[PDB]
């Protein structure tokens, strides 16, 4: 019943060739498998980069039918304390293989949430029973892992998804769901994805839901911005132009009108203005400092909440004061 | 402050069994117990002050001799004693007759912290072996005794169920019904059911349900009555039901549960009351 | 089929002569092995520089045939509670095993830094009771985790970080044993990425050979990444804010490094940053701490890191 599933858990890759983006890691692990030697892998990267899918497809490729007993997967949902590591992991990586020979695979999903004592006990299991067992460690934060564990694990870095991988996955989704996507909407979707496939899948599902009749109807950038509630680039450019050139009253009026036209959030406008101003050429190096600092505290205050109009006026005043240094 | 009493188990069986059951119950409930020696009755109290309270009344005619004298009102001598020492003394005295004897158990208050000189005899087979014991107790003050009172029970929604006597045909079946919920290891709350006669033991949880029901004949002495209580108190209720023929169950809607046990000595009747608060709300 | 031991364990040294690095310490271990009178010792240092293998080789050359029932290797993977220490260590120490006149039983306690304090006191009692028949060897990362009374009876040996020359020698031995193609630039890149870790060097070399074959700088830097502490140090030491921002973005944000990792690395680098003033160092520490608090509270965007870099540059160039 794959039609009764969210799009994120509907297009999970089943084979290694279905994982896009991380070509180097996929080729390296495939060479490892074909050569017959697999070290203690360690997968590191931002969420949604395809670490769990890659390791699951790798385990399926290695053990086609014996995946149930040749693979032991533990994650943050199960207790992974000192006792679990001492007993269950040792018992799994202490017995002989059933009939598949090869080696036993132990996957530690989100190992950054494990305690330090658990990792200290796990390092000796890893370096002791490595003849017949290989460990895989998946984590988004490397600072929460013991340096010895990183030392005994071969580190693989999962980069954020490039453009072409997003295009290929979106094309596959469109072919499967019989959907149409405008190139402008395609560009908008990749920009908001931020190297995340789950965000792309969720936004595509929401856009298909947004259409009154899914077939014979294209998904435009307007549909994307209406479904996800993000400001259009034209709105951001107009707001920045009004703040930079116009006086205070009309800039405030323009910001209020732009925000009230579609119900836009101030934090999204702040992120858009930050992204646009990064492309600007500033010749003072004090405008950069003022902009970054003032916008950082404004974003933090928005994260803690407060008066929204005061925060918007603060954004306008901060930008104006920072650009007064460029004289 | 002159307290002295003599107990003969073989002379009067029923009241000695009542005393032994009270001692066992107060020992199983919690450590230490309150012995209130009023001039006409002895009350054994186990006050944890949610957890239940046991209020057993023992008449003065139970013991062969009941000299109780103190400067307080109605010669009220109140004392706190460890149940384990008293339980061990009572087990020794019970084994004394079990091996064959009829000797009396003499108890005197020999000296605020005092001790009872519980001494009795035993004869193996025509030898004299004197068993002497001294259980350290503390003497509760008069105001501290006044701070302990039996909790009154409202009768606005309280409904009585006359549980069948265990000596009858339905007594063993009802005992099995009561202990049917005790064989589950992972049970902490029992939610009772009475609609207006049926007694239903319902244990509802996240992923399992239990519907023990009593289909036998029952009497209510003379409307839904639900109260959820802990399993440990239900064990005490089951233990009390086995040792008492006249057992009365009172259920209050979302307020409390009362387990009344009575021993018809007729003569003043010995009664045991176990007040149980609801563990949580319906 | 898949049967091939990883090069980390396939080439684990079995004798003290194959251990590179601390030449003086290895020579002392050889002298102890040839003498026999091994005292209580504590071995500490960075991970993967040859602490566990040195102790195992010393025990093997000190007992030989009696290694099967003359050593007791307990680690963090095994239970090491006060009851376990009591029972097992007392029974092993009391055991009367006949040995050469200069030979003693060895109790190898790997990962001794993760042992409970009550077990440490039990170890004190066992050492004071049975020091004439058995000896205790401690392997740890830092000696501070072992209590002072335990360290009082032990001869502390400190393992320094492996030099580039010793790592190169062991690596070249492995190339000559495996007969794989290599380039001097590739070996230099492997050493540079290893950062004094021998196990990391072996893992990176094995991955490079198994993924690309010939070991050059291009393949190595295409499979493994440059150490992010060095990238963070370069970012913090930039002159102007634009270069630091560009380095931060294109080397930590486009590469897929978490912001909390960047903040922790910046804190460590600032703690170990030379050629800077104390006031500047403490101001950057305070700024990194404020950024760390903001990241922990939930605001983990690139804007916070950019603001941290801007404030660091503002304090660097003053006002």
């Amino acid at each position: 019943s794959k039609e009764n599933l969210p799009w994120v858990e509907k297009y999970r890759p089943e084979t290694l060739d279905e994982v896009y983006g991380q070509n180097e890691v996929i080729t390296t692990v495939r060479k490892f498998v074909d050569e017959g030697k697999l070290p203690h892998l360690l997968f590191y990267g931002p969420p949604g980069t395809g670490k769990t899918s890659t390791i699951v497809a790798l385990a399926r490729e290695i053990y086609g039918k014996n995946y149930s007993n040749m693979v032991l997967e533990l994650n943050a949902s199960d207790d992974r304390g000192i006792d679990v590591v001492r007993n269950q992991i040792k018992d799994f990586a202490s017995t002989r293989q059933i009939f598949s020979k090869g080696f036993k695979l132990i996957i530690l999903d989100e190992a950054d949430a494990m305690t330090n004592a658990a990792q200290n006990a796990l390092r000796r299991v890893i370096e002791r029973y490595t003849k017949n067992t290989r460990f895989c460690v998946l984590a988004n934060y490397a600072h929460k892992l013991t340096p010895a564990l990183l030392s005994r694990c071969t580190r693989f870095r999962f980069q954020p998804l490039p453009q072409e991988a997003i295009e290929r996955r979106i094309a596959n989704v469109l072919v499967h769901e019989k959907l149409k996507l405008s190139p402008n909407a395609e560009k908008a979707l990749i920009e908001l994805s931020n190297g995340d496939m789950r965000r792309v899948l969720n936004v595509l599902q929401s856009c298909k839901a947004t259409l009154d009749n899914p077939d014979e109807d294209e998904i435009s950038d307007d549909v994307i911005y209406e479904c996800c509630g993000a400001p259009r680039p034209s709105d951001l450019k107009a707001v920045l132009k009004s703040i930079l050139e116009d006086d205070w009253g009309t800039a405030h009026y323009t910001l209020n009108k732009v925000r009230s036209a579609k119900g836009l959030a101030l934090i999204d406008l702040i992120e858009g203005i930050v992204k646009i101003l990064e492309d600007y050429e500033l010749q003072n190096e004090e405008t950069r400092v003022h902009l970054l600092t003032k916008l950082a505290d404004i974003e933090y205050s928005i994260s803690k909440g407060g008066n929204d109009q005061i925060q918007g006026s603060a954004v306008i005043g901060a930008i104006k004061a920072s650009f007064e240094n460029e004289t | 402050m002159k307290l002295k009493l003599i107990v003969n188990g073989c002379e009067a069986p029923d009241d000695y069994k009542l005393l032994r059951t009270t001692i066992n119950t107060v020992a199983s409930l919690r450590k230490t117990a309150i012995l209130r020696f009023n001039s006409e009755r002895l009350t054994i109290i186990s006050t944890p002050k949610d957890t239940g309270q046991l209020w057993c009344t023992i008449p003065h005619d139970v013991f062969r001799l009941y000299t109780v004298i103190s400067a307080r009102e109605l010669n009220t001598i109140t004392m706190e004693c460890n149940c384990d020492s008293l339980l061990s003394v009572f087990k020794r005295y019970d084994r004394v007759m079990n091996q064959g004897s009829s000797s009396n158990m003499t108890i005197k208050l020999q000296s605020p912290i005092c001790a009872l000189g519980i001494t009795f005899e035993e004869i193996v087979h025509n030898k004299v072996i004197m068993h002497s014991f001294k259980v350290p107790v503390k003497l509760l003050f008069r105001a501290q005794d006044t701070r302990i009172q039996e909790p009154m029970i409202n009768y606005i929604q309280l409904m009585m169920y006359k549980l069948p006597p265990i000596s009858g045909e339905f007594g063993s079946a009802f005992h099995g019904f009561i202990r049917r919920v005790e064989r589950y290891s992972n049970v902490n709350h029992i939610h009772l059911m009475g609609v207006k006669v049926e007694l239903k033991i319902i244990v509802n949880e996240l992923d399992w349900h239990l519907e023990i029901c009593w289909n036998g004949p029952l009497d209510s002495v003379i409307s839904t009555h639900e109260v959820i209580i802990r399993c440990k108190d239900w064990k005490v209720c089951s233990k009390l039901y086995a040792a008492f023929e006249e057992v009365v169950l009172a259920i209050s809607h979302d307020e409390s549960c009362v387990f009344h046990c009575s021993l018809d000595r007729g003569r003043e009747r010995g009664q045991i009351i176990y007040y149980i608060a609801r563990s949580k709300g319906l | 089929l898949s049967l091939q031991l990883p090069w980390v364990e396939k080439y684990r040294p079995q004798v003290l002569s194959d251990i590179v690095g601390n030449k003086e310490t290895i020579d002392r271990l050889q002298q102890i092995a040839k003498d026999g009178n091994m005292p209580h010792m504590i071995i500490s240092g960075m991970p993967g520089i040859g602490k566990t293998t040195s102790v195992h080789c010393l025990a093997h050359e000190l007992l030989g045939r009696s290694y099967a029932d003359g050593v007791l290797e307990l680690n963090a993977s095994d239970d090491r509670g006060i009851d376990v220490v009591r029972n097992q260590i007392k029974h092993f120490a009391q055991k009367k095993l006949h040995l050469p006149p200069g030979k003693h039983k060895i109790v190898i306690l790997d990962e001794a830094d993760s042992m409970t304090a009550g077990a440490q006191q039990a170890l004190r009692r066992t050492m004071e009771l049975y020091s004439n028949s058995t000896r205790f060897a401690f392997a740890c990362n830092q000696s501070n985790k072992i209590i002072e009374p335990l360290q009082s009876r032990c001869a502390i040996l400190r393992y320094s970080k492996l030099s580039d020359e010793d790592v190169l020698k062991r690596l070249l031995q492995i190339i000559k044993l495996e007969d794989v193609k290599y380039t001097n630039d590739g070996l230099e890149a492997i050493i540079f990425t290893a950062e004094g870790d021998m196990r990391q060097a072996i893992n990176n070399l094995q991955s490079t050979v198994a993924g690309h074959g010939l070991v050059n700088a291009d393949n190595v830097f295409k499979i493994v990444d440059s150490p992010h502490p060095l990238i963070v140090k370069k970012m913090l030491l930039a002159s102007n804010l634009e270069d630091s921002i560009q380095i931060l973005r294109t080397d930590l944000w486009k590469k897929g490094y978490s912001s909390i990792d960047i903040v922790t690395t910046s804190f460590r680098v600032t703690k170990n940053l030379a050629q800077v003033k104390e006031s500047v160092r403490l101001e950057m520490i305070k700024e990194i701490g404020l950024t760390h608090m903001r990241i922990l509270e939930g605001v983990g965007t690139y804007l916070q890191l950019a603001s941290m870099l801007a404030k660091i540059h503002k304090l660097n160039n003053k006002a």
Partner: protein
């Protein structure tokens, strides 16, 4: 074949590395404790590891026990690893004490508790407390002398939780014994100090000349003096010094001499942060080593309070108010970082930089003190009890719900004044709650 610290153990009192005053006031206490009616019941010895605490008691028992023993020599040491079949673990020490209580007349033997039972488990720690409390309060007409030696060591961090207790941080007599045991009339405490350089040098020289042939064979005899001085300078542990000397002598190469590193005390760390450390002019290196070696003490709110309390003792308070304002502002800023390591690092670095910039020769500093925050907490607890009493009497004789906020603001001073005139001119509470406010 044997360890040097074991084969060269003292045979008499003259070979024990101990100060003359320490030997004298331990001898006097032990001799007084062997009297038929001894004022002191037990003897408590505290100090760092390898401070001749255990051995001096043995050599004293070799000369005191045979003298006071009746007619019809060593200590009766508790052994914790003994596992008896019918003995629960918490009852082992109780059984040991009950058995050792029968050592008074014609069976006299000193009792030496060198290794205590497992005190890191709370139940047996409380059992130990109430077991040694009963010994001091025992109604026994005469008891054998009891000697307890506790090694003052810092327990390293093992598990991550903010329910860390006193025993979890450091292993000292204060964390083990409570206030009742320590402040007892029948308890005598003799704290110990690390062995000085002079005794260490003398004993290392004696050990060296006891093995003269082996150092002369390895040509290390000419270099033995500098090794002895350097070892005595580095550490104060006699066992560690002898072990290091044996390791150096048995060596055949140029291996550098290393010894165990002693932890830095609380007031030692306070002085290091305030006045700096000699032989280390780099503040960054000193702070980094202090944080790496003593992170347990540094990562505590007690240390920041100690700095705030003792930063005015740099020159008896004779420094610019700008420096004090900067220090207290930095401490207030660090208090808002929720205990991050960066907060402690920044605070210590700023304090050290501030005190380094104004440092001058000839400065006469003051004496540092522990923070008084615990006294303030105790006074607040007393105020809470008195306010609870006031609210109880005000809610029992009549119906009046007043908030504790109003009790502290106005009712803590106005209401006692009302009850004063009302009573003298003619309710229960007449004095100001928490006492009067002075200055």
């Amino acid at each position: 074949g044997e360890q040097w610290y074991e084969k060269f153990k003292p045979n008499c009192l003259e070979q024990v590395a101990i100060h003359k005053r320490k030997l004298k006031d331990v001898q006097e206490a032990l001799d007084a404790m062997f009297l038929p009616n001894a004022k002191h019941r037990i003897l408590l010895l505290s100090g760092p590891s390898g401070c001749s605490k255990s051995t001096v008691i043995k050599e004293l028992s070799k000369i005191l026990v045979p003298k006071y023993r009746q007619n019809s020599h060593k200590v009766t040491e508790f052994r914790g690893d003994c596992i008896v079949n019918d003995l629960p673990q918490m009852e082992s020490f109780s059984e040991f004490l009950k058995g050792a209580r029968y050592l008074v007349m014609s069976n006299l033997s000193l009792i030496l508790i060198e290794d205590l039972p497992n005190v890191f488990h709370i139940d047996t720690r409380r059992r130990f407390q109430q077991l040694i409390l009963q010994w001091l309060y025992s109604s026994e007409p005469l008891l054998p002398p009891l000697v307890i030696c506790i090694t003052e060591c810092e327990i390293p961090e093992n598990d991550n939780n903010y329910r860390k207790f006193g025993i979890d941080y450091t292993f000292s007599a204060e964390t083990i014994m409570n206030k009742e045991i320590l402040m007892h009339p029948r308890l005598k405490r003799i704290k110990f100090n690390p062995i000085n350089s002079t005794l260490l040098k003398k004993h290392l020289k004696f050990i060296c000349v006891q093995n003269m042939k082996m150092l002369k064979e390895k040509n290390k005899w000419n270099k033995r003096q500098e090794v002895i001085d350097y070892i005595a300078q580095e550490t104060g542990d006699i066992r560690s010094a002898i072990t290091t000397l044996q390791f150096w002598a048995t060596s055949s190469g140029s291996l550098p001499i290393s010894t165990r590193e002693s932890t830095i005390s609380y007031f030692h760390a306070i002085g290091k942060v305030i006045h700096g450390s000699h032989s280390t002019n780099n503040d960054n290196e000193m702070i980094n080593n202090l944080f790496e070696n003593s992170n347990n003490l540094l990562s505590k709110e007690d240390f920041k309070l100690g700095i705030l309390e003792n930063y005015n003792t740099f020159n008896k308070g004779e420094f610019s108010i700008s420096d004090a304002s900067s220090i207290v502002d930095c401490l207030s800023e660090c208090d808002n970082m929720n205990g991050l390591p960066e907060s402690n690092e920044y605070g210590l670095r700023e304090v050290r930089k501030t005190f380094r910039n104004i440092s001058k020769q000839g400065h006469n500093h003051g004496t540092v003190y522990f923070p008084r925050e615990w006294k303030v907490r105790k006074l607040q607890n007393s105020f809470k009890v008195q306010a609870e009493d006031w609210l109880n009497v005000s809610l029992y004789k009549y119906n009046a719900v007043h908030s504790f906020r109003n009790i502290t603001l106005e009712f803590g001073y106005y209401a006692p004044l009302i009850r004063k005139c009302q009573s003298y001119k003619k309710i229960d509470v007449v004095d100001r709650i928490g006492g009067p406010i002075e200055a």
